[PDB]
Design a protein around this ligand. Structure first.
Ligand SMILES: CC[C@H](C)[C@H](NC(=O)[C@@H](CC(=O)NC)Cc1ccc(OP(=O)(O)O)cc1)C(=O)N[C@@H](CC(N)=O)C(N)=O
Ligand SMILES: CC[C@H](C)[C@H](NC(=O)[C@@H](CC(=O)NC)Cc1ccc(OP(=O)(O)O)cc1)C(=O)N[C@@H](CC(N)=O)C(N)=O
Lengths: 101, 101
């Protein structure tokens, strides 16, 4: 197993936008630890000339979700959204960022 | 910025032990998403011929901690424990795993 290329920890929201702006393909994303909401995660995704931000929500048991379907881990939430759009306005599917070697 | 080499998402506790057992230096670690406690994180660390597991605890606001000092993110908790032992029985400091290229 290898570490996930999408977990950036505590990077500012603006930094996520700076990074994803340079990505070529829509869907390029990263999970970050919110600075405005300590203890919560945020999902930042590239789409066109913009970067969309989503709150990773939790149900009463601690399961994670964006809209309706929830999971036992961020890992599963991320994988589910690689084939089910994270957006309700466009078909945007998560894909790993082209990491800098 | 680059993704953190310590976040492995949802990997089994046994898999974390398998991986860390191969690491040469004490302190080599990874953060994983608990399978027994969905929504919670676990910290696995190598020490000698064993792999120690810690529950990443949360306070009422969602801050993370192992013992007493708490942080606004897993990222900060991890960095704090690179210079303050995660153990009360041995001086074990977190250090990035020697990732396989
Ligand atoms: C345009 C992207 C998506 C579609 C849209 N996003 C949103 O509504 C954003 C709004 C925002 O960024 N406010 C500052 C949600 C959001 C709110 C705060 C936030 O703070 P940071 O952790 O500091 O970045 C991050 C994201 C949405 O409808 N989100 C849904 C679904 C979701 N899980 O976010 C919602 N608002 O419940
Ligand atoms: C030997 C390692 C450390 C020192 C020790 N660890 C512990 O007590 C472990 C016990 C355990 O693994 N039970 C199965 C805590 C622990 C408990 C459950 C667990 O489940 P998984 O997410 O499925 O792996 C992981 C770790 C401890 O005293 N931990 C403290 C501090 C902490 N934050 O874990 C505690 N138990 O509160």
């Amino acid at each position: 197993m290898k570490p996930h290329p999408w977990f950036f920890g505590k990077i500012p929201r603006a930094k996520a936008e700076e990074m994803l702006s340079k990505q070529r393909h829509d869907g390029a994303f990263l999970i970050r630890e919110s600075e405005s909401a300590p203890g919560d995660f945020s999902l930042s995704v590239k789409f066109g000339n913009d970067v969309q931000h989503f709150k990773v929500l939790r149900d009463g048991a601690g399961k994670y979700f964006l809209w309706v379907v929830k999971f036992n881990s961020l890992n599963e939430l991320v994988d589910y959204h690689r084939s089910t759009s994270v957006s309700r306005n466009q078909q945007i599917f998560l894909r790993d960022i082209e990491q800098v070697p």
